[PDB]
């Protein structure tokens, strides 16, 4: 599983995202900007790990959280603890920033 | 006179946090189009280490950032309630204005060109 240790490392991977979503999964392409910054506004200072669809771990304050994309809803799903449960939060473009924002604060 | 490098993510997590926990208590026309910046800026930076210059003191800052070789600048202006972004010269006129109401597909637009 890839490590997001450092900027050069997340500014690829978020690249690497943008690049998927616009060519793939275009309903999703816009939000995924505003996911970023809310994941990295929140997280702990354990870093961000991306596994094998792929799955996006991080820890916001003393919870982890997975983030990954469903081909079928076309959604950016979140899960609390093990990506083995529902979700807790979908996102796409028809999301509110409003609601991210709330979402990311309550964390 | 004071420069902050954002030289790891452990930094530039705090400094997300102190833009947000700002914008939450006085600069709430922006607080939303903040994280969206927040990621169009980390997708299309070049190597080069973003800068925030204060030149007054914490109050009075610039972010700078480099993208295809073009320096850009993002500053708040209290007044019309927006992030200004600027290109080169940060004494030239904006290119863009940001706030809540800005169309993601607008912003992404934007970046994606640059």
Known sequence: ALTVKDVNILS???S???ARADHHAGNVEEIALALAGAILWRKDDTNI?????????VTINGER????????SEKIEMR?????????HEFDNST????????FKGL
């Not at 790990?49 to 771990?57: E, G, H, I």
């Open 12 to 14: 690829q991977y978020i």
């Open 16 to 18: 690497g995202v943008m």
């Open 49 to 57: 790990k991306v596994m094998a669809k792929n799955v996006l771990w």
């Open 65 to 72: 959280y997975a983030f990954s994309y469903n081909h079928s």
């Open 80 to 88: 609390k603890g093990n990506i083995q449960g529902n979700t807790i």
């Open 96 to 103: 509110p920033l409003s609601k991210l924002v709330e979402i």
